[PDB]
Amino acid sequence: SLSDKDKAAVRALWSKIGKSSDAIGNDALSRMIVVYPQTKIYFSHWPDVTPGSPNIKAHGKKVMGGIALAVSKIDDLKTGLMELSEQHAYKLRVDPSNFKILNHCILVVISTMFPKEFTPEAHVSLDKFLSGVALALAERYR
Amino acid sequence: SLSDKDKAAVRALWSKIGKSSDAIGNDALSRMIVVYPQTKIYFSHWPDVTPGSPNIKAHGKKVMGGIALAVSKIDDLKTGLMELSEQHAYKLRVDPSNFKILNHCILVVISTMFPKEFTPEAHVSLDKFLSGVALALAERYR
Amino acid sequence: VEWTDKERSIISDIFSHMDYDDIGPKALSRCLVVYPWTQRYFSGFGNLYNAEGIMSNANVAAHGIKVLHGLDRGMKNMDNIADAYTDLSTLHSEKLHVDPDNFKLLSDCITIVLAAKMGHAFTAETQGAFQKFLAAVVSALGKQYH
Amino acid sequence: VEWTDKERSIISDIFSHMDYDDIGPKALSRCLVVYPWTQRYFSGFGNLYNAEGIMSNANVAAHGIKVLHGLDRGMKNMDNIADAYTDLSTLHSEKLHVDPDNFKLLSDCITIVLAAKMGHAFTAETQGAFQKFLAAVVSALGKQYH
Ligand code: HEM
Ligand code: HEM
């Protein structure tokens, strides 16, 4: 679970990098589809699962909107994401394993984009939080 | 998280298999070091790292006693196992990934030993529970 | 790669007495309730609403028996497992769009179902040899994914 | 495995511009605070008690430098990576007794430090190439375990 320290760390970092969340998302998803090719199967319903694609840029903006929501619900992510979870659970049926993948791509994006901000202390608490989100999303899987 | 349904399934199964926890523990930890040999590094300080040995019979009774406790604190694994959790962090320093491995081996032993009782529904609840314990053990690591 | 002769005997033993018509359904039904997202690929099958339905769904039964027989090529091809699933892997990758992580999960359900059936005889060394095999096949199935 | 000329060239580029004195410390320090159980193997180093101490620890710094140089054999023989780490893999298991999963954790930290440094330059294709190499090395180090 997230500590007060953890909680203060994600908020200060989210407070710091939140401006460029639209770019963070596009780059993360891009990275996901290119490095973890297996993940494209979930976007086969699209005609163009390609880096920076028209559509790719969109779900990316989508995903980081869910990350910012998660920051604002950080004291009870499980309740804060019941809707997000019902969608990947019930509607998309995305293996939780991929949440892990995306998370590693997200750390890389932010590390590239905000190297001074992404200290090892920012990292461990942020990694604690993204694992925290993944489990909230898994909430209605089984 | 565990539903009231999930909590119920874990309680009735333990009600059933609880007596043979010593057989589960021996068998599980034994299986563990044989099929995933790399986990024996955590027992590198011991004189008898092999299945059935006094010590595997030893660390076995304890581990299932932790599970027995976990069943007892099933409404709050986090609070219930903080005692054990700080031990594996600071005292044992077990990489949590190995919890996944142990959790698998216990599911397999219980299937050998209680094939009638270990139905898919019980399975999903128990797997959810052991993940829940695995998280609880990770509580004090970082 | 590499296999010990005993590893060879174990796998040959296990398969030689495998009741595929029994083990298949139970492993694929089992997988569908403990990893419910795997139901995503069996739309046309029908009911995946509750555990009961799944466990009494004929289509799933027929499909797990098929997926279990699938393993045969690999067992009858111990030193060239990747080549034996290259097409199966393309089938799984380009035609059906299955996420390869699910391969690991069904394997685990198979391990647990055989374990039930084999009980005490499912020794740790037996387990290791079967899992190593199930592991090779899954590396093979996810190969043509990209 | 199979290497594309682009991958060879990507690995070559990255290694050619690597500041081992800067990356090594930072990647090792990062791992010790992000996956604190890795601290188990570095008793003698001194202060490993919190992030500050770790990140100003000379012992830690020097060992991050050795560890990264540890990849040097690898990319300097892209087709025989498995072989090149046999001896290191034997040391890590029989003489140091380190859990192989930790190689993954430190691999990711190396990757994340490289990214900060390289920023915009760490394209996905660079990340895929770089991760592909490190996965090769990691498989190699956990090879002599049993
Ligand atoms: C950081 C973790 C994640 C977050 C915060 C997240 C969030 C979201 C959000 C906010 C939506 C918008 C709903 C919609 O599009 O209808 C969405 C949809 C979707 N997500 Fe995720 N998601 C995450 C992980 C994943 C992963 C790992 C995958 C694939 C492997 C995935 C696949 C999808 C798909 C396919 C859609 C629907 C496509 C569409 O927009 O029509 N998600 N997700
Ligand atoms: C189901 C999860 C587990 C539970 C409930 C559990 C529980 C326990 C308990 C109750 C103790 C006794 C220590 C004390 O009370 O002072 C213990 C010790 C220990 N555990 Fe765990 N454990 C689990 C998983 C693991 C795993 C996966 C490993 C490594 C692969 C591990 C390694 C150890 C070691 C090395 C000891 C100390 C014994 C010695 O002196 O050699 N544990 N564990």
Ligand code: HEM
């Ligand atoms: C041990 C791992 C597996 C083996 C050996 C295996 C084998 C097979 C075989 C032999 C077929 C028949 C192809 C045909 O119909 O021409 C098949 C089809 C199929 N498999 Fe797999 N499979 C495996 C894992 C999976 C998993 C994990 C999933 C789902 C997550 C899956 C989903 C499917 C689907 C949807 C079909 C097509 C149904 C049909 O036959 O009409 N498979 N598989």
Ligand code: HEM
């Ligand atoms: C990419 C992964 C890694 C590589 C390439 C690597 C490489 C090396 C190298 C080159 C040495 C020096 C041995 C000699 O003097 O010949 C070494 C030693 C060592 N490694 Fe690793 N290593 C890796 C990961 C790890 C991890 C993750 C840990 C534990 C957290 C670890 C623990 C150690 C220890 C304890 C030593 C011995 C140094 C001493 O005597 O204090 N290694 N490793």
